[model samples]
Target chain A: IQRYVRKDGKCNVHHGNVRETYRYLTDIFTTLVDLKWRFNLLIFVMVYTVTWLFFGMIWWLIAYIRGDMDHIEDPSWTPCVTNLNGFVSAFLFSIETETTIGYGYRVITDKCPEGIILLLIQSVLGSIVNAFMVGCMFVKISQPKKRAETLVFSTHAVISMRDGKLCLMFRVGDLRNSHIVEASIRAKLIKSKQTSEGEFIPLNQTDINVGYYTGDDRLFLVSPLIISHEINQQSPFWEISKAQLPKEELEIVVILEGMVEATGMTCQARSSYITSEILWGYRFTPVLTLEDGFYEVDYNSFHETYETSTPSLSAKELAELANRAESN
Target chain B: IQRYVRKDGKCNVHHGNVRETYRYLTDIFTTLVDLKWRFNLLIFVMVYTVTWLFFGMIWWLIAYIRGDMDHIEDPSWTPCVTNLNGFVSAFLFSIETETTIGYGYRVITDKCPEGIILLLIQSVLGSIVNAFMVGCMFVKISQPKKRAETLVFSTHAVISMRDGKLCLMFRVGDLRNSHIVEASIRAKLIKSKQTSEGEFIPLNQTDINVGYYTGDDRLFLVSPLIISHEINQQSPFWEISKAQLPKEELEIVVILEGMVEATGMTCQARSSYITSEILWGYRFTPVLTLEDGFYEVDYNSFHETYETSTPSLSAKELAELANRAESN
Candidate 1:
């Protein structure tokens, strides 16, 4: 089962291994927050309307059981004169009271004190219902998922030369004016592994070293950040050539976690690249341009890459070339 | 100006230097998320009720002007019934309409076609109001701030011996069964500084290294985890003696950033210790226990610490002592 969201916008279906001990309310609300836009909105509307109707019926019953109908001897309360039906009238009365309209015509008279009690009960219940429903809707709407949408990841990973060494690189940037604070980006390689006992592990995840200026995990992402992993002997790509990528069954998942400086709430953005999405002999087009004494970034060029001078050599081959060059 | 939350639960208030350019809705909602709980709830109620009253008055004016009231030869259509006052009756009628009760006794009829259009308008307006109000409430309630409450940080930081070297330590843990994923903890020291020219800097923050194993920032917090920073020459506490701590005017802020493994959203917890909150020669009591082949953590001991042996020498003095011992 997949634990994280992938590039295709699909979540894996898995059950079991979940220890449940009565926390369904929290689970339900959080699940509502995670649902798709349309579905979440639909649930909000459905729950709201259903609650309204349910309480309306209860109010109708109170008015009916109390024999308060037409007790005030008014034509407006008269039965179905091109208008009022018994259930519909009772339901409307409920709506009026629940919404605190308190229209005079169909109100509780001195004879029906029970109607007043029911009205009070419905008002408090309505307030609670409003609180819970509104809370759910707010959570669904304010989710950082919307913020994550503006965070863009490179369309493809690339094999390139960085400071005379073969490295794998990817870029990520935020389209908004203000970006995340202390945003740390991490990359991991997931591949199928076979043990010495001939046992196969479906997904073995190993951390891939990535950095900006130095080999550090923390990132200060004020602008577009270039994350690179040196293809040393320890790298999984050390023996795998560009041509061997397709057959290697490798996937790189990159995660950026940081605090939203505006809210001080943490936000995480994630993206993944499969073997096929890695481009060979390519480098990212520079997106920043200095204009009018200000550095302006062209988002159109964010994902655009161009061919660069690079060797079609695996990391191991690059290491050997560097050694031979040093000896010469 | 302050950017982070302080130990006293007060946020800094600063004005000016804000570049504004038409995104106040996001600003408003995000601000609501940061507001105090009672104040946020008060706003929601006030806005909802005020909206209901305003729309109700509009409906009442429409019906009163159209001559649909009292002209129908029905007492129910009259302004009052020994039950309601003029404004109150009209106001209630508007509530009924806005809530979609349509109780027939007081509704938009053929005599007033404009009232029908107004009814439609009110319904749409009511829905929008509900959406906005509910959205605000939800965002306020589902905030990760509640989760941060359950995350407990050590009451005091301690200077003690670890592997025969001076180290500063603290502890943090989750009170819930499930834990955060890829949890990373960070520490920073804040102190007042004076430049060579005698310019005063109120607060200068420097990152401090802390970890249990592997010596990286990531933490495995299934149980209470002890965080340690070696008081080496490079450390902020390297040259300071225990007796001089109170006079130094120092503060250490620790932040825990991680993803809620279930929701896959990022969460951060923060705590700070002033000079007085740091204890010398102390160690946290172990909270984990193995019971019947299962690991159990005792929360009672979560905040408990005990006295331990530690050297009186500063890091500089300790280094000198080590050199002398090597020479001997």
Candidate 2:
């Protein structure tokens, strides 16, 4: 009842009981990039606030150490910073310096070498923090995963005869104007099987051949695609007839992978079909029609399918019948 | 002397006579996204500046029309904005409102209805500009293309005997701590050949198989890989011997494509090997060593190779010798 990969291409598996914290810490950029929007925004605000507070404390210390805090209104005495204030004014100065507002009030004087040193350090750290925190926010917002939202797969797969061969097929399409680059489709079969030697395998994964020999796995994706896999000797479903479908437990997981043309990032869209979700003796209906000078795809019939004439016998039985006819 | 695709995976082909200017206008987001960093930064500053100036001029006109600018010392007259002043002060107020600094020197009062409408419009447009400009900056800064800079390819490809079969091989490695995901390699033969007809072909592309049928093209890429293409009957180099090598014009273009572990974006690393860059009867040196608890890759000798014993005759000639021995 559980799918390994969801329709949104998110994996259902979670790695619990992880104990090596340093591995995650070592690659901290991706760890932060994967955070939710609210968490990242909170982090973004705190880094700036913490940096400002840290520098503010240093500035206040310098003013206090020089006794500039007690030298206000002393015309004869030269203080380190003008307007000789307490912690709040120093914190305000820190914000103005970090934000580069240059408010021109409560300025630091040439008498303070320590104040100049703090400014240099603050400038470097400010750029680094802005580079990373802002960059993290950008990556999360422009994620190609959202682009996969408009990419769609059919509700069900179908089994029918194509080119006089029994084949299993499904539909995939993109609703957006931009097409994916170097788009490729891959499939896997998840089934539990037992070996004759008394070895049991649970949820064993076997590759389903789509078009490895001729590179048919790669697609252009200008319109809806009906990807088919011939039910030959190499296929795991070579012996499954229409009537035996319900008794057999199997799942076909199809994955479409490609680069988003706009962002140049990879987007993977996935969907799985259990035995019951597959329709026997059915084929996908047409949704693409040439309209005048341009083409239009009709979403009204995108998931529509019609019944078709197909052989009820398994491919293995059909091959045996052909062998007997050849002998005669 | 020219490459179809550069080492950075940038295609060299340019669409010179393009006439569809509207197409570019429709996909304006990407057009702006792909702008140079300086251009994007300039646009970023100008959008905020121009928005502030436009709103500031609107505020100045409203005050002029309402006679609020003439009542600076008049206690009986009320202004839409506090501290009734000229265009410069209006611009300063615009900056404070947009930045949310609220410096408290100049503030907006609730007496004017037009002022409230302008504030709402400014709030909406301010968000749209910040979302796009800031997001554009983030994409340029965190681009995975720069990640490919740390990914490396060997200086040259080699040809030698491996497992008693002739093969053309090249080395690829990643220098970064993070590894690429679902890494795959593809190669193309860039050579022009006549089809035994009177017509001539220039720069024809032919696929060089490196195990598409067996899915051997997919690699883990944790360590250095010696991607090899076996020189069998289907190989394009079947008839080229060491003596006949220089007479033929051939180039091998190899492309390694994968998703960056940090950004989850696609990074493609590419390189090409001309006939002169390929050394015959050579094999790559071992760069991997199994250390205590961890494996290490020595990049010092990554591009190094040593000569190996191989047949100087072509694969066709080698096949003929076995054919004659079996006949006898």
Candidate 3:
């Protein structure tokens, strides 16, 4: 059975043996970065505790071999009394040293040279390990990802009229009061194409014009912007009518990229509209409300679209009608 | 002191009393999500440890009031060997229970009803705390932000002659073997514009054409693609001469967005070319090499640009010269 490729062009099935290409050490870091946060956290806690325990065991052996833990003059050296287990005492001592959480009870006496040397090594190793973990954690946290959350696209795109011409239109807005700097938008229509030789290639991206001012693609997202693409002789939508939309396999992907004015980090917002999500003869309601000489946006109406009267005629048919009318 | 706004049009300093408003409880989650990863990790560890210690204190107080901690008949109750301090034993038991490490020695027993209740509460609270930390970690780790690293823009934009017409050109490429589905590109020229009323707006954006094919903004970025815009009446570059290039204040921002064919996540790549960075009379070298009836891309020369000799005449002068040559 042939596997169906998804909208993003990835096949669902894996054909080869997964174990053949395993690299445990490097894959751990990659997985930590790429996998769900829960897994990453679990691995982090487990790795830390295991390292602590491993060092703790080494400390326990040194104390047991030296026989100096219980005989120390300071009663705070070990919490144990009559039945002092070497393994448990050393493990607890290791934890206290690694965490630097000395409870005024456990102490590493100067009697054993091995004990002093191991303590110094554990302290240095612990600091280095903490720094490495902190670095990884910061990289994941400092990403300017939440900014994309405030960037949004309209739920549905509409095929409507603009300046007496058929146009595909949609709305995009920023939810936050702060605007993205140098914000620009791009839209494309993707459909699958098969060659005569039966070679299946899943990409045919056609860029659409979303600019309002002459040919300006740059956007001021402080307010909601209406993006439109005119259906002319060059448009793929020239022959596509409202009724034939379901039969067409199409995905309209929109990308908005800009610098977060506050962070100077680039953020990208994206949305894709399948053919089924396209609404015919609809117009988005105005989101701006005038108050005290300044306009306030009412986001309640941001996604609300209304029905409009539109022609079902294709662009070519409309052009032919205009030609005939002109001649007459 | 007067605050300075950045190039992106955001203020550098905030003026207000720090304690003017407060939402301490609600802000924790927001801060955990938006702050650096090290902060998030610290918060998680602190919250978990504090809760454990709090419960341990309660258990220690109960044991002190109950008066039967050592005399209890059950061996599983407390691991303390007669010399164990009440506070230390309770704390150690809390750690074991919270981590579910349950070192067979220390545990809660039915001998004390309050100890059992506290134990149940600690277990349930520990589980809830763990779940919350996992959620925060997952959100930070699984973001699709890194996909943009694989998408790239050219190092420099160039203005040179293409087919005897003045054009602005640049190149963009994808480093990965897998192509981004429905990739689209947009370019805009942004410069400061002063209104007649003397108000300063940060930008005047002008869009440019990148290709000759109808609806040709779509990019097949398996290899580097050169995008160009013709310098015509509508172009911002139309009036600017080669000699006057440095005098103009112009920044051209380019954005590329697409869905990853492998992950289905939206990825965006962005770059900008300031007036100083724009190269004159330069062209990029071809990166595609045909090998055994298949195409192979050499990325070594991906950013390489070569000097090309071309006429320096403006578009209008060139048009006039072409007309004169045709008449002769």
Candidate 4:
């Protein structure tokens, strides 16, 4: 009766929705939990053991293949192997030696250069793998995620108009929250101007809107990306009069940047999507000065542009006109 | 009678104490209520403004005394006699420009090469200051006071250990609460190692423990680093014998990483301190493994005869001892 309330209200509409939500939620939670342990423990042991085993197996096989094996049943204090027993004994000893696990079950004479080389290679590989894991572990642990309940962006975005030029602003948060003073916040337009050699040189002169506290923890980050600068008559997303604008292919790039507030940490989360995405889409213009380093954007421009529908042109008519109207 | 009903029953003395406690509690509550907002908001704003202004005024006065009045404003903007206005305008413009705030009102026009040159210099100087401030701001906003924060390691630090023939293990968790995980980590290690020609090569190595979740955002990360072989005696931080250990002059850089788990995301926190402060230090015995485009360190020997202690020798002392002992 409860399930069938309101003529099975929960049956058709909400069932799938509920299941999908539950599944997605559980998936995210499960992933986070898995990552926590895998990053902190599981992977390290697995990597270490696998790496060790790999070297262990390789040396075991190599020594046996090369006829460097020996077995011994004498006093466990014997120096080297001399027979089949000695071969087995030496193989075990050689493994330890190769891994540098040398508890001295067997000793290598001054004559085995091959053994020395094998031992050297195995030992180095093990150390490097171990070091890498250790470094990864250290980095994983040392990162400043523990200092806050949630990581939020402390700096506000800004738009700056200067010298007949315009730019946006952004800033990164600080890694260390040590200074007792108010952390400055801000943003700057960071555009990579190309040189003759085609290298992207970071340009700071572009307009940037200062945001809240303009300082290290709250970095001044801005991207000088104007949507209109890229739009043209050729874009299918927009409608342009033939006389108002010339048709030409234009290459445009938008750089997006933001910072994590808790660590004042900066990360470039950039998507170099095609400019056509904004041909008639809503786009913001640089506007308000937020703080010393942060900025505000003019959403009005974006909304206004997005809301207006352009005159629709039929494809066949346009194609026919193009074919018949001009001669090169 | 009221005291007797509460917890501890005494005489009229208790009553008197209760009255006193009530008065004191009110005073404290009042203080807390008033001081809370003032201490945080008002004080912070005041402190920031005062400190910034103090330094700003000093720069202004210095420019005046030096007769470097040109430093105060854009020569294009007509010079004014009002000192305060001049200073404010200069400071405001300087702050804006430095932070990459290109307010169109202040234009660097032609015919004033001197002004252009001065403005250019100021812009450059401002940019640097702004950048520094942005960095500091990020640090501040990250708020290290919060618990379970993770920190990112410098790229060079990780490589040094790798090249040192060491094996590394990484894990992340909360310092106070252990919900440690491995997949929530990422790292960048910076290194400057000596080449065959004896030239130091600076290289950056990045290892993400979690592999793909964007970046490490956890509270605590633990990475165990073990060295498996004797590194080159000339390497940055290595020397064994009591007499040869460089206690001082040598730098023992240790980067400890971890991640913080909160809400749903894992934030990262890293604490990079010197070995002198660590309870247990490590050493390396060389193990070299070659792979595609790189080499790996073997660390199977990490568990062998690991030493843990407090060294009485200072870094300088250790450096001297190591120089003598390891040189051989």
Q: Which candidate is the best by TM-score?
A: 2
**TM-score of predicted structure 3:** 0.54
Whose lDDT is higher: candidate 1's or candidate 2's? 2
Predicted chain B of candidate 4, TM-score versus the true chain B: 0.25
lDDT of 2 at A128: 85
lDDT of 1 by residue, B139-211 (tens): 5555554456556676877887755677787777665544465678887788789899989988788887664
Across A71-118, the per-residue lDDT of candidate 1 in tens digits comes to 646544432112233676766755666666655565443333454345
Q: What are the lDDT figures for the candidates, one per model? A: 0.65, 0.74, 0.65, 0.35
2 versus 3: better lDDT goes to:
2
Worst-scoring 10-residue span by lDDT in model 2 chain B:
B11-20
TM-score of chain B, candidate 1?
A: 0.77
Instruction: Write candidate 3's Cα lDDT for A80-187 as tens digits.
Output: 322235565555555545655443344444444555667678899988876666556655555665566556567878887765688788887665444465677887
Q: Write the per-residue lDDT of candidate 4 for residues A148-167, one digit (tens) a residue.
A: 22112211232222222223
CAPRI grade, predicted model 2:
incorrect
Which tens-of-lDDT digit does each residue in B186-287 have in candidate 2? 877776565432223344556678889898899887788888888889888888889899777777777677777866777666677776788888888997
TM for candidate 1 is 0.54
Question: Model 3, range B126-235, lDDT digits (tens) per residue?
Answer: 64566567767876675555677767667777888867688888777777667788878777666667644233434445567675247788766666788878888766
DockQ of each: 0.05, 0.05, 0.04, 0.03
Report the error of model 2 at residue A298, Å: 2.3
Instruction: Note the residue pairs that clash in candidate 3.
Output: A37-B138, A76-A105
Cα displacement (Å) at residue B91, model 1: 3.7
